[PDB]
């Protein structure tokens, strides 16, 4: 079977939601964990605490361990943290060495989310040690249309929003950013004395959420 | 010339010997302070001196699990970096020793007299924390576009949360604040808070930098818990470009504490988070080092670029200060504001200070129009100097 | 003889005492290659089995474990 | 023996007098033991043709 899945690329597409959704389908126990995060007080005492967590998550198969912010665990680099991070880092490599089989591959699944693909364990990059590794590209035309549709279900579906038309207008807005946009669209709507989110309402929400601000420098803006 | 010169040589030897004597001059006596009632006190103190069971050490239980064939032990860790077990000299119970709870234990019995409040981190931080603000828009540099945008986040969901809940949206509570220093980013956040009639608490990330490695995350977590407890409040994080800021994965510097703190902070926020009109603001005072994780839209709903007061907003705030002190009215401040580039509210108030001072030098007690001209020349140039070559950054 | 042993362990068992964690066991043979005092025993002047512990100061000790609860039980 | 000390091997020494009570056989890090036992492959160790 496939050993697991690796997710990398700029986030904001919903790397935490995605992990949660898949894990829900399966009814596999969902650990949201990150390697060095249970270090309490000193480095000595904290080494033990973090190592124990790593092992615990792998066990109780079947399971899905979700690793967030693996930049630190990865140690592509020539320096290490040499605290609790080292322990979690070694146990991962040993674990991947052991995983090749038919039998552990199904049972223990791993899903990971990290910002880049070049600050993960040097082994991971060597070969496909997790089957199918996915990069998420910049938002395609279909992607945009879909991020709008799901959100309109969440609030309400107006006759005014047209997903096909909407996708064209905007460029390069991902899932997270989009959620903020739908919340904003709603802000506009409440001012109007409406419950409906108008097509104009969605659009306007887009501008508030970015770096852009009212009363622009430009004389066309 | 000549007669004096010998007095010079001798005086130096004199001063050397005197430096030792100041110690004696202050007092030979070993005492600090003492009144007749600490004599009574002293008899009691003597026993405590006598016995090595006291003084009481401060220790902290990292986790509760132990209670191995004696009334509950737990692992309490003293600050000599050694772990010890507890016994009763008052009591011990699941509730007397907890996950965060600090304890008083003996040097040579290790028995608990008293538990102390959970963690060191929430008691110290309490002094730093100020309560409900009382500041207003005129003071920030007048009505600014950035001010109105804070109203949308703060005022609307707080005052009427019922509309956002019915509609199907979650309400927005987050803002990312960025720009150069002196804009009045905290000042603006506070300004909107007062009108809205909601509490404000400052949190400074730099003020708590109590470390033993990974310790820093436990502090972040505590500051967040405290904000959450106060409903209908705003929490503003100052100085979080470090410890809860940018990672260093290219490093060769022996750090992991900023990274550890970052890890915990992203995780708490991400997915969901239990809030109820707790507005989360982040202020980043560093353009050089930025934390991308926090910075992008999402759970933290909007980004606003914080810009210096517009031309009407700076004229208006200056007017208010100007009337208070002695100024000639018909004031040339307007001519200077228009002539000059964007000037912040902090900057204009320094004009008034500097103009007063030129006026004193001239030997008038009225600060005249001439004085304001010199004061603007000085301020505009000083602000202007800082560079960090922004084009270089745009390219990469 | 038993009551006398039993009271002495208890005086040892009462606080103060260090807490640490056991990273690994070894359990090496009793009587390595030596003779000194007392008798061949699990621990004494002659010690066989031990467990290595990593304490919270970042110091390591390999020590012999008491036979009331053995290193094999550890 | 005086062969129970050689560079890198474990020794137990008494605390109060720093004389050698015994030989302590060297620790074996579990990490090295994992590397010896495990084969990361799932492919033949005889041949792979053309390689």
XYZ file of C-alpha atoms in Angstrom:
742
model
C 0.000 0.000 0.000
C 1.041 3.589 0.020
C 3.252 4.384 3.063
C 1.678 7.838 3.487
C 1.176 11.212 1.886
C 3.492 14.323 1.964
C 2.043 17.861 1.645
C 4.259 20.850 0.838
C 3.885 24.203 -1.031
C 2.792 27.470 0.238
C 0.050 26.762 2.814
C -3.270 28.466 3.284
C -5.049 25.844 1.062
C -6.082 24.205 4.255
C -3.336 21.791 5.050
C -4.786 21.265 8.735
C -8.474 20.918 7.392
C -7.383 18.420 4.726
C -5.657 16.153 7.202
C -8.722 16.270 9.573
C -11.161 15.494 6.701
C -9.322 12.383 5.489
C -8.878 11.104 9.074
C -12.587 11.643 9.695
C -13.546 9.426 6.695
C -11.466 6.649 7.862
C -12.359 6.907 11.630
C -8.660 6.690 12.416
C -7.468 8.453 15.517
C -6.226 11.922 14.630
C -3.094 13.301 16.394
C -2.322 16.789 15.686
C 1.239 16.887 17.068
C 4.534 18.582 16.432
C 7.884 17.167 17.557
C 9.332 19.384 20.306
C 6.275 20.853 22.102
C 6.039 19.000 25.350
C 9.466 20.164 26.744
C 8.645 21.305 30.264
C 11.122 23.421 32.145
C 14.559 22.003 31.591
C 16.034 20.375 28.541
C 16.728 17.107 30.506
C 13.387 16.502 31.750
C 11.782 17.799 28.469
C 13.816 15.443 26.256
C 11.943 12.502 27.728
C 8.520 14.088 27.482
C 8.787 14.937 23.742
C 10.219 11.427 22.757
C 7.426 9.617 24.502
C 4.808 11.656 22.597
C 6.292 10.692 19.246
C 6.124 6.967 19.974
C 2.662 7.192 21.502
C 1.164 8.722 18.365
C 2.656 5.929 16.049
C 1.133 3.288 18.289
C -2.676 2.552 18.654
C -2.775 1.557 15.120
C -4.492 2.213 12.894
C -3.677 5.881 13.144
C -2.883 9.038 11.376
C -0.213 11.222 12.858
C -0.326 14.825 11.518
C 3.004 16.602 11.795
C 2.853 20.441 11.636
C 5.923 22.619 11.262
C 8.436 19.917 10.508
C 10.998 22.464 9.490
C 12.582 22.010 12.890
C 12.411 18.039 12.958
C 13.833 17.952 9.357
C 17.452 18.989 9.926
C 18.333 19.130 6.207
C 20.851 21.527 7.698
C 24.200 20.946 9.270
C 23.062 22.118 12.731
C 20.611 20.501 15.112
C 18.734 21.875 18.114
C 20.253 19.254 20.564
C 17.472 19.492 23.122
C 14.218 17.601 22.753
C 14.247 17.933 18.885
C 17.021 15.464 18.380
C 15.191 12.596 19.925
C 11.976 12.998 17.870
C 14.280 13.459 14.739
C 16.092 10.098 15.141
C 12.985 8.074 15.961
C 11.384 9.356 12.637
C 14.278 8.035 10.501
C 14.251 4.619 12.211
C 10.558 4.492 11.750
C 10.686 5.183 8.056
C 13.419 2.473 7.652
C 11.042 -0.055 9.447
C 7.840 1.043 7.562
C 8.724 -0.615 4.204
C 6.544 -3.669 4.024
C 3.003 -4.368 3.161
C 1.831 -4.628 6.708
C 2.956 -1.431 8.643
C 2.187 0.725 5.535
C -1.551 0.472 5.810
C -1.706 0.501 9.538
C 0.428 3.427 10.439
C -0.256 6.349 8.025
C 1.539 9.577 8.291
C 0.454 12.837 6.832
C 2.709 15.890 7.129
C 2.325 19.532 6.313
C 5.358 21.798 5.979
C 5.931 25.204 4.142
C 8.788 23.930 1.955
C 9.949 20.460 0.802
C 13.716 21.254 1.450
C 13.759 21.269 5.267
C 12.336 17.809 5.792
C 14.513 14.781 6.699
C 17.311 14.105 4.020
C 15.917 10.534 3.752
C 12.372 11.701 2.751
C 13.651 13.465 -0.275
C 15.687 10.375 -1.139
C 13.349 8.166 -3.177
C 9.569 7.946 -2.639
C 9.570 6.826 0.933
C 5.968 8.053 1.106
C 3.832 7.109 -1.991
C 2.424 10.154 -3.854
C 3.928 13.471 -2.684
C 1.879 16.430 -3.530
C 2.779 19.943 -4.173
C -0.301 22.330 -4.228
C 0.071 24.777 -7.185
C -1.017 28.372 -7.234
C -4.808 28.611 -7.528
C -6.094 27.290 -10.916
C -9.380 28.496 -12.471
C -11.316 25.341 -11.113
C -9.749 25.847 -7.616
C -11.065 29.377 -7.350
C -14.581 28.418 -8.401
C -14.744 25.574 -5.930
C -13.424 27.629 -2.857
C -16.298 29.994 -3.497
C -18.951 27.252 -3.845
C -18.281 25.461 -0.549
C -18.395 28.762 1.402
C -21.699 29.793 -0.192
C -23.117 26.512 1.233
C -21.846 27.554 4.691
C -23.649 30.889 4.794
C -26.351 30.921 2.134
C -26.626 30.580 -1.636
C -27.751 33.850 -3.311
C -28.970 33.982 -6.937
C -26.340 36.708 -7.442
C -23.080 34.792 -6.934
C -21.876 33.008 -10.136
C -18.778 30.955 -9.471
C -17.576 30.833 -13.106
C -17.735 34.657 -13.415
C -16.221 35.185 -9.958
C -13.068 33.003 -10.689
C -12.053 35.325 -13.630
C -12.166 38.536 -11.653
C -9.777 37.554 -8.939
C -6.358 35.926 -9.080
C -4.218 34.041 -6.598
C -6.524 33.591 -3.561
C -6.260 30.363 -1.557
C -8.601 28.581 0.853
C -7.735 30.309 4.126
C -7.727 33.724 2.552
C -11.099 32.868 0.938
C -12.664 31.955 4.318
C -11.663 35.367 5.516
C -13.259 36.792 2.403
C -16.629 34.984 2.987
C -16.624 36.246 6.698
C -15.957 39.850 5.199
C -18.641 39.476 2.559
C -21.019 38.871 5.507
C -19.771 42.005 7.273
C -20.863 44.058 4.184
C -24.134 42.336 4.053
C -25.062 43.059 7.731
C -24.441 46.817 7.006
C -26.861 46.801 4.042
C -29.752 45.378 6.249
C -29.423 42.102 4.422
C -28.886 38.485 5.103
C -28.227 37.693 1.417
C -24.500 37.970 0.328
C -24.697 39.850 -2.920
C -22.185 39.266 -5.822
C -20.800 42.764 -5.054
C -20.429 41.799 -1.357
C -18.087 38.862 -2.098
C -15.925 41.119 -4.339
C -15.642 43.838 -1.832
C -14.611 41.395 0.880
C -11.570 40.415 -1.256
C -10.016 43.980 -0.923
C -10.301 44.308 2.759
C -8.597 41.059 3.546
C -5.313 41.791 1.670
C -2.604 44.469 2.359
C -4.783 46.914 0.309
C -6.578 49.780 2.286
C -9.336 52.401 1.487
C -8.264 55.730 0.222
C -5.514 54.321 -2.128
C -2.380 56.251 -3.400
C -3.517 55.817 -7.061
C -5.835 58.273 -8.770
C -7.707 55.462 -10.569
C -8.097 53.715 -7.215
C 50.855 77.708 37.893
C 54.027 76.462 39.421
C 52.900 76.725 43.055
C 49.692 74.811 42.362
C 51.343 71.928 40.426
C 52.648 70.172 43.637
C 49.137 70.326 45.202
C 47.922 68.358 42.156
C 50.321 65.362 42.785
C 49.433 65.110 46.465
C 45.674 65.461 46.013
C 45.591 62.250 43.683
C 47.086 60.089 46.535
C 44.501 61.576 48.853
C 41.557 60.651 46.550
C 42.707 56.950 46.247
C 42.584 56.330 49.983
C 39.194 58.154 50.291
C 37.452 55.801 47.751
C 37.879 52.909 50.346
C 36.582 55.217 53.188
C 33.175 55.986 51.490
C 32.235 52.453 52.504
C 32.886 53.234 56.128
C 31.389 56.736 55.895
C 28.038 55.271 54.888
C 28.191 53.142 58.050
C 30.601 50.659 59.804
C 27.420 49.074 61.145
C 26.328 45.805 59.619
C 22.632 46.807 59.756
C 20.293 47.804 57.029
C 17.030 48.816 58.766
C 15.490 47.707 62.104
C 12.984 49.078 64.586
C 12.261 47.936 68.153
C 9.408 45.452 67.111
C 11.672 43.254 64.837
C 13.451 42.272 68.148
C 10.306 40.131 68.958
C 10.407 38.893 65.451
C 13.984 37.819 65.786
C 13.408 35.139 68.463
C 11.242 33.256 65.919
C 13.739 33.954 63.163
C 16.513 32.306 65.251
C 14.838 28.829 65.109
C 14.308 29.163 61.407
C 18.078 29.977 61.121
C 18.906 27.044 63.399
C 17.078 24.474 61.457
C 18.092 23.454 57.963
C 14.685 22.068 57.223
C 13.858 25.834 56.554
C 14.321 28.012 54.440
C 11.684 26.724 51.920
C 12.804 26.198 48.340
C 10.661 26.929 45.334
C 10.167 24.044 43.025
C 7.641 23.342 40.317
C 5.798 20.103 39.453
C 6.090 19.682 35.632
C 3.467 16.709 35.695
C 1.384 14.807 38.064
C 1.641 10.997 37.930
C 3.474 9.746 41.086
C 1.951 8.517 44.309
C 3.982 5.353 44.748
C 3.081 3.761 48.011
C 2.789 7.057 49.986
C 0.426 9.936 50.123
C 0.830 11.676 46.724
C 4.574 12.235 45.863
C 4.674 13.788 42.301
C 7.900 14.887 40.574
C 8.615 18.422 41.746
C 11.752 19.984 40.235
C 13.859 22.391 42.121
C 15.785 25.179 40.277
C 19.151 23.348 40.937
C 17.962 21.066 38.136
C 17.309 17.954 40.207
C 13.912 16.114 40.793
C 12.495 15.223 44.210
C 9.474 13.732 45.819
C 7.099 15.328 48.271
C 5.594 14.315 51.543
C 3.132 15.880 53.941
C 3.886 18.519 56.452
C 0.436 20.148 55.813
C -1.155 17.799 53.331
C -0.750 16.432 49.819
C -3.685 15.745 47.516
C -4.394 15.613 43.749
C -5.353 19.354 44.037
C -2.412 20.435 46.300
C 0.161 19.433 43.668
C -0.866 20.023 39.909
C 0.646 20.231 36.491
C 1.695 23.900 36.754
C 1.692 24.324 40.615
C 4.833 25.492 42.251
C 5.545 24.210 45.847
C 7.521 25.076 48.917
C 9.754 22.137 49.925
C 12.542 21.772 52.450
C 16.333 21.548 51.689
C 16.826 18.469 53.788
C 13.394 16.835 54.154
C 11.554 17.761 50.970
C 8.112 17.967 52.505
C 5.450 20.435 51.476
C 4.491 23.309 53.812
C 2.417 25.130 51.146
C 1.743 24.997 47.352
C 2.320 28.360 45.601
C 0.250 29.775 42.694
C 0.557 27.853 39.475
C 3.633 29.011 37.530
C 5.962 31.839 37.895
C 4.797 33.301 34.515
C 1.247 34.725 35.320
C 2.265 36.576 38.614
C 5.142 38.553 37.194
C 3.340 39.481 33.979
C 0.406 40.970 36.055
C 2.428 44.037 37.014
C 3.170 44.759 33.267
C -0.489 44.421 32.248
C -2.619 47.667 32.279
C -6.443 47.620 32.349
C -9.243 49.389 30.442
C -7.840 52.278 28.313
C -9.092 55.859 28.260
C -7.656 57.456 25.088
C -9.491 58.854 22.032
C -9.139 59.418 18.287
C -7.782 63.002 18.374
C -4.818 61.768 20.344
C -3.804 59.127 17.752
C -3.371 61.837 15.041
C -7.119 62.422 14.292
C -9.363 60.229 12.180
C -7.068 58.045 10.022
C -8.334 55.291 7.476
C -6.557 52.647 9.662
C -8.758 53.802 12.610
C -12.067 53.130 10.793
C -10.797 49.646 9.684
C -10.119 48.753 13.404
C -13.740 49.743 14.165
C -14.926 47.106 11.681
C -12.978 44.333 13.520
C -13.470 45.527 17.147
C -16.627 47.586 17.405
C -19.090 45.751 15.182
C -18.811 42.087 16.416
C -18.364 43.121 20.076
C -21.342 45.411 20.515
C -23.682 43.241 18.407
C -22.261 39.571 18.107
C -25.814 38.268 17.451
C -26.000 39.323 13.795
C -22.752 37.539 12.776
C -23.887 34.311 14.558
C -27.313 34.194 12.867
C -25.940 34.968 9.409
C -23.683 31.960 9.316
C -20.328 33.735 9.511
C -17.952 33.542 12.366
C -16.995 36.984 13.410
C -13.514 38.481 12.449
C -11.267 39.268 15.359
C -7.869 39.275 14.038
C -5.711 42.008 12.458
C -1.992 42.015 11.414
C -0.307 45.351 12.208
C 2.832 46.314 10.407
C 4.720 49.428 9.559
C 7.589 51.654 10.855
C 7.888 52.578 14.542
C 6.028 55.707 15.917
C 2.805 55.356 13.858
C 0.749 54.751 17.013
C -0.303 51.189 16.340
C -0.969 50.261 20.015
C -2.356 53.892 20.499
C -4.892 53.325 17.662
C -5.893 49.870 18.922
C -6.472 51.397 22.366
C -8.392 54.315 20.878
C -11.065 52.178 19.314
C -11.280 50.035 22.435
C -12.250 52.890 24.728
C -15.248 54.011 22.549
C -16.405 50.472 22.068
C -16.314 50.086 25.915
C -14.089 46.951 26.097
C -11.036 46.017 28.186
C -7.470 46.190 26.902
C -4.468 44.316 28.109
C -0.938 44.889 26.835
C 1.224 41.742 26.612
C 4.868 42.183 25.829
C 6.634 38.976 24.580
C 10.095 40.375 25.499
C 9.168 41.191 29.060
C 8.923 37.412 29.896
C 12.011 35.699 28.747
C 12.314 33.187 31.507
C 13.975 30.178 29.840
C 15.196 26.673 30.675
C 14.500 25.579 26.996
C 11.023 24.920 25.682
C 9.920 26.886 28.808
C 9.081 29.833 26.544
C 6.156 27.954 24.942
C 4.464 27.418 28.422
C 4.581 31.270 28.896
C 2.910 31.903 25.481
C 0.189 29.460 26.379
C -0.426 31.028 29.763
C -0.720 34.659 28.322
C -3.300 33.306 25.845
C -5.273 31.524 28.540
C -5.559 34.696 30.604
C -6.902 36.767 27.661
C -9.571 34.101 26.924
C -10.787 34.214 30.593
C -11.730 37.937 30.102
C -14.667 38.107 27.680
C -15.260 41.294 25.929
C -11.581 42.271 25.795
C -8.770 42.880 23.295
C -5.253 41.380 23.611
C -2.420 43.075 21.897
C 0.851 41.295 21.498
C 3.851 43.716 21.474
C 7.392 42.633 20.647
C 6.677 39.124 19.182
C 9.271 39.221 16.398
C 11.092 36.905 18.803
C 9.856 34.200 21.071
C 6.737 33.539 19.055
C 8.239 34.957 15.833
C 10.365 33.961 12.862
C 11.999 30.489 12.693
C 15.654 29.905 11.945
C 15.945 26.721 9.901
C 19.064 27.886 8.156
C 20.643 28.659 11.509
C 24.017 27.877 12.878
C 23.409 29.659 16.118
C 22.230 27.169 18.710
C 18.621 28.463 18.886
C 15.432 26.545 19.119
C 13.564 28.589 21.731
C 12.065 31.056 19.210
C 11.101 28.031 17.110
C 9.628 26.163 20.083
C 7.419 29.163 21.021
C 6.367 29.549 17.424
C 5.316 25.930 17.238
C 2.901 26.125 20.171
C 1.413 29.495 19.048
C 0.497 28.437 15.487
C -0.995 25.183 16.694
C -3.267 26.820 19.285
C -4.743 29.296 16.715
C -4.946 26.939 13.725
C -8.159 24.951 12.918
C -10.384 26.463 15.576
C -9.744 28.358 18.766
C -12.067 29.038 21.740
C -12.641 32.854 21.801
C -15.698 35.014 22.492
C -14.992 38.624 21.447
C -11.238 38.347 22.179
C -9.592 40.265 19.523
C -6.114 39.185 18.690
C -3.759 41.979 17.334
C -0.153 41.398 16.378
C 2.405 44.196 16.038
C 5.632 43.519 14.194
C 8.240 46.108 14.692
C 10.772 44.350 12.539
C 10.548 44.332 8.683
C 13.841 42.438 8.553
C 12.520 39.300 10.404
C 8.927 38.360 9.852
C 6.940 35.242 10.774
C 5.065 34.066 7.685
C 2.795 31.576 9.552
C 1.050 34.242 11.560
C 1.194 36.893 8.812
C -1.101 35.367 6.042
C -4.928 35.690 6.190
C -7.145 33.096 7.754
C -8.023 32.705 11.392
C -6.336 36.121 11.908
C -8.865 37.769 9.465
C -7.291 40.946 8.019
C -4.154 42.704 7.195
C -4.071 46.442 7.285
C -1.018 48.425 6.259
C -0.478 50.972 9.038
C 0.284 54.321 7.567
C 1.161 57.718 9.151
C -1.571 60.342 9.847
C -3.024 62.189 6.716
C -2.884 65.944 6.366
C -6.217 66.809 8.206
C -5.507 64.286 11.018
C -2.122 65.781 11.859
C -3.377 69.460 11.799
C -6.237 68.547 14.116
C -4.100 66.771 16.807
C -1.462 69.634 16.789
C -4.239 72.168 17.389
C -5.187 70.439 20.586
C -1.711 70.522 22.106
C -1.059 74.082 20.742
C -3.850 75.782 22.599
C -2.639 74.382 26.015
C 0.767 76.014 25.850
C 1.637 79.616 24.807
C 1.488 79.875 20.981
C 0.619 82.780 18.571
C -2.722 82.021 17.028
C -3.085 82.203 13.196
C -0.301 79.521 13.517
C 2.015 78.732 10.555
C 1.689 75.078 11.308
C -0.709 74.621 8.403
C 1.719 76.022 5.751
C 4.490 73.696 7.129
C 2.232 70.547 7.217
C 1.247 70.975 3.589
C 4.797 71.662 2.477
C 6.158 68.665 4.164
C 5.739 64.925 3.549
C 3.540 62.589 5.779
C 4.234 63.378 9.498
C 3.050 61.304 12.420
C 1.258 62.482 15.553
C 4.367 61.727 17.718
C 6.420 63.947 15.472
C 4.136 66.985 15.624
C 4.051 66.915 19.420
C 7.959 67.037 19.428
C 7.557 70.261 17.181
C 5.654 71.958 19.988
C 8.344 70.874 22.536
C 11.242 72.075 20.327
C 9.521 75.375 19.350
C 9.056 76.166 23.058
C 12.721 75.610 23.664
C 13.937 77.840 20.729
C 11.702 80.465 22.118
C 13.293 80.281 25.595
C 16.757 80.626 23.861
C 15.623 83.826 22.128
C 14.424 85.113 25.539
C 10.665 85.258 25.043
C 8.086 83.341 27.047
C 5.852 83.054 23.993
C 6.738 80.562 21.452
C 6.467 82.436 18.147
C 6.075 81.414 14.544
C 9.729 81.482 13.736
C 10.392 78.808 16.394
C 7.932 76.289 14.744
C 9.892 76.511 11.440
C 13.159 75.418 13.038
C 11.349 72.580 14.990
C 9.730 71.076 11.714
C 13.201 71.115 9.908
C 14.723 69.156 12.710
C 11.909 66.514 12.982
C 11.325 65.724 9.331
C 15.003 64.968 8.672
C 15.535 62.603 11.620
C 12.505 60.364 10.717
C 13.722 60.264 7.089
C 17.236 58.712 7.661
C 16.524 55.114 8.368
C 17.071 52.669 5.437
C 17.102 48.924 5.142
C 17.281 49.111 1.234
C 13.661 47.873 0.566
C 14.231 47.223 -3.140
C 16.684 44.393 -2.281
C 13.971 42.637 -0.389
C 11.386 43.100 -3.157
C 13.609 41.287 -5.607
C 14.188 38.107 -3.576
C 17.229 -10.779 61.211
C 14.290 -9.968 58.859
C 12.802 -7.153 61.048
C 16.175 -5.402 61.209
C 16.663 -5.421 57.409
C 13.082 -4.306 56.845
C 13.329 -1.148 59.102
C 16.657 -0.057 57.427
C 15.316 -0.085 53.885
C 12.417 2.159 55.065
C 14.785 4.801 56.606
C 16.445 4.863 53.041
C 13.015 5.019 51.316
C 11.979 8.232 53.175
C 12.809 11.620 51.536
C 15.180 13.243 50.520
C 15.881 11.231 47.272
C 16.496 11.983 43.531
C 14.075 11.047 40.713
C 15.344 10.251 37.205
C 14.217 8.147 34.206
C 15.376 4.835 32.906
C 16.463 5.199 29.231
C 17.751 1.570 28.861
C 18.584 -1.490 30.937
C 21.714 -3.600 30.400
C 21.305 -6.508 33.031
C 24.946 -7.780 32.964
C 26.115 -10.847 34.759
C 26.593 -11.165 38.574
C 30.289 -11.216 39.603
C 32.191 -9.856 36.687
C 35.730 -11.048 37.318
C 36.526 -9.841 40.733
C 36.375 -10.784 44.325
C 36.405 -8.033 47.145
C 34.180 -8.218 50.163
C 30.899 -9.777 51.417
C 29.488 -12.484 49.219
C 28.603 -12.892 45.489
C 25.167 -11.169 45.333
C 23.052 -9.207 42.839
C 24.506 -6.045 44.316
C 27.000 -5.542 47.311
C 30.709 -5.023 46.864
C 30.054 -7.370 43.878
C 27.336 -6.109 41.525
C 25.967 -7.749 38.416
C 22.828 -6.335 36.806
C 22.368 -2.585 36.422
C 20.080 -0.029 34.637
C 21.315 3.199 33.077
C 19.284 6.233 33.824
C 19.374 9.666 32.327
C 18.589 12.063 35.183
C 17.289 15.611 34.852
C 20.570 17.561 35.109
C 21.838 15.932 31.871
C 24.008 13.537 33.825
C 24.020 9.774 33.336
C 24.425 7.071 35.902
C 24.547 3.352 35.426
C 23.718 2.012 38.849
C 22.897 -1.344 40.381
C 19.187 -1.798 41.286
C 18.149 -3.163 44.702
C 16.785 -6.739 44.669
C 13.490 -5.826 46.390
C 12.616 -4.694 42.916
C 15.132 -6.018 40.492
C 16.809 -4.531 37.343
C 15.087 -7.418 35.448
C 11.732 -6.069 36.964
C 12.903 -2.489 36.031
C 42.964 -7.189 34.638
C 44.571 -4.085 33.442
C 42.916 -4.930 30.242
C 39.530 -3.988 31.790
C 40.522 -0.457 30.953
C 41.167 0.407 27.351
C 40.162 3.621 25.758
C 36.322 3.951 25.365
C 35.094 1.053 27.444
C 32.890 1.534 30.515
C 34.277 1.240 34.038
C 32.484 1.528 37.514
C 34.615 3.248 40.042
C 33.814 3.869 43.683
C 32.609 7.292 44.415
C 34.504 7.972 47.640
C 37.893 6.543 46.737
C 38.027 6.399 42.935
C 39.340 2.876 42.660
C 37.975 0.315 40.236
C 35.303 -1.866 41.812
C 34.486 -3.528 38.599
C 34.362 -3.783 34.917
C 31.210 -2.367 33.409
C 30.469 -3.792 29.897
C 30.054 -1.057 27.354
C 26.616 0.324 26.460
C 25.238 -0.458 23.107
C 23.323 2.465 21.762
C 19.927 1.144 20.435
C 20.319 3.311 17.384
C 23.326 1.296 16.041
C 21.453 -1.969 16.841
C 18.455 -0.730 14.637
C 20.926 -0.012 11.765
C 22.461 -3.491 11.938
C 19.071 -5.436 11.918
C 17.035 -3.446 9.457
C 17.195 -3.665 5.656
C 15.365 -0.670 4.147
C 14.743 -2.526 0.878
C 11.993 -4.781 -0.383
C 13.925 -5.763 -3.499
C 16.337 -8.794 -4.300
C 19.797 -8.860 -2.782
C 21.130 -11.282 -5.368
C 20.929 -9.208 -8.551
C 18.972 -6.518 -10.374
C 19.613 -6.935 -14.021
C 21.537 -4.280 -16.059
C 22.570 -2.659 -12.829
